[PDB]
Amino acid sequence: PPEGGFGWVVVFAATWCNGSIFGIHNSVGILYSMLLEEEKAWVGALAMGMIFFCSPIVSIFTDRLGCRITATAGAAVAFIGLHTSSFTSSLSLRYFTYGILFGCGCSFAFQPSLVILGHYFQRRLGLANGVVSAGSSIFSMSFPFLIRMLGDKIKLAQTFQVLSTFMFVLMLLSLTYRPLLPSLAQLRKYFNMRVFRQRTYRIWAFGIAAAALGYFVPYVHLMKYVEEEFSEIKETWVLLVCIGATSGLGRLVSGHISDSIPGLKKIYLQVLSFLLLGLMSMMIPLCRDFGGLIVVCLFLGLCDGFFITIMAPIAFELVGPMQASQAIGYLLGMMALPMIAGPPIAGLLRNCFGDYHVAFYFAGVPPIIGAVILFFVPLM
């Protein structure tokens, strides 16, 4: 492949996808507040989980139709969802219009964004994925502040209109996904399940799906933990700045260095990104000083980066460019449920003991189990 040229354009488009999806999701809570201030928590998770739960279908549509058509359709559906959100005034139409439309369109627009990078970059696929991931991370962490500032000025409908504008620009950028590689019986044709005929992929996906609960618990619950335990410190934005900076840096660096790792050995990066996190999840209760929290945030971002930034290229390397959309889609589908179920269970455990210690101690285990499971994949 070119490993450059028009590929870089695609990278930009890919970035505009990720940061504009997750970022918008990061704003959901703010939007909820808006609603309350105009009328004086599960739909937000449903819409976000629809990105990964519906990915297996997007994989089929990507193998059959293509990256461009699927991405454009998903972007159009997301635009329509945000549009009808701007128009709807209800608590039942909001659920349908946001979740079923916007999240599904996000899934359809998000699945092909990695397969296209795989189309254009082979030797420098890791670096392109790292660029996309770092840009997406920065944009996602920056979006909610802009949404809050808009809320201070305009109402909810206008905000939904701006989000639909973001989705519109996304769909326009999605047309740069120019194909570069070739492309009851119908039920068995669409669900052949050929990637699950390889032990390496099976065990890799199983480990990644097993790690997700405890992988995602700390990131959601750190802010609440610091707010509860540490009430006498006012510089809480330092934590966010540290996490974001180190996470973007780690994403870029991991994407770069994953290219120099010959074969399946890059899987080892992921284990470390699960090992330390695991261990880190069991030392958050032990932090008595601000500096300890800062160090934990640095390590949290470092662990966050590698996982995603190589999970994409490792998915492309395990099975090949042909069976890459399917592998990515089913990895995402398997991760869909545990990631959503984790933080809820962490909160439930917190409510049953009055402290986050047990929640973090239990969330530190699944990542370690996943790391141990993944450690044995490169050995065969």
Ligand X SMILES: COc1cc([C@H]2Oc3c(O)cc([C@H]4Oc5cc(O)cc(O)c5C(=O)[C@@H]4O)cc3[C@@H]2CO)ccc1O
Ligand Y SMILES: C[C@@H]1CC[C@@]2(OC1)O[C@H]1C[C@H]3[C@@H]4CC=C5C[C@@H](OCCC(CO)CO)CC[C@]5(C)[C@H]4CC[C@]3(C)[C@H]1[C@@H]2C
Ligand Z SMILES: CCCCCCCCCCCCCCCCCC(=O)OC[C@H](COP(=O)([O-])OCC[N+](C)(C)C)OC(=O)CCCCCCCCCCCCCCCCC
Residue 76 partner contact from ligand X, ligand Y, its own copies, none using kind-dependent CB cut-offs of 5 to 8 Å: its own copies
166 contact partners, CB below 8 Å, separation of at least 6: 20, 24
In whole angstroms, what is the distance from residue 326 CA to residue 194 CA? 9
Of the CA atoms within 13 Å of residue 45, those in its CB half-sphere come to 12
Closest separation in Å from C-beta 43 to ligand Z = 17
Residue 77 partner contact from ligand Y, ligand Z, its own copies, none using kind-dependent CB cut-offs of 5 to 8 Å: ligand Z
Q: Is 93 in the site for ligand Z (CB under 6 A)?
A: no
Residue 175 partner contact from ligand Y, ligand X, ligand Z, none using kind-dependent CB cut-offs of 5 to 8 Å: ligand Z
Q: Is 139 in the site for ligand X (CB under 6 A)?
A: no
Closest separation in Å from C-beta 182 to ligand Z = 13
In the numeric block, the tokens 């899987």 are attached to 267
Candidates 73-81, 111-119, 123-131, 144-152: pick the segment binding ligand Y (CB under 6 A): 144-152
- Compute the chain's Rg from CA coordinates: 20
Among 15, 18, 26, 111, the residue binding ligand Y under the rule CB under 6 A is 26
Mark residues 56-95: x for contact with its own copies by CB under 8 A, - for none.
--------------------x--x---x--xx--------
Chain breaks in the chain (C to N over 2.5 A) after: 40, 183
Cβ proximity to ligand X, 133 vs 164, nearer residue: 133
C-beta nearest to ligand Y: residue: 304
**Residues 292/298/299/300 CA torsion (nearest 10 deg):** 100
176 contact partners, CB below 8 Å, separation of at least 6: 6, 9, 10, 13
Residue type for position 276: L
Tell me if residue 208 falls in helix, strand or coil: helix
Binding positions for ligand X, rule: CB under 6 A: 18, 22, 25-26, 45, 48, 133, 136-137, 140, 216, 219-220, 304, 308, 339-340, 342-343
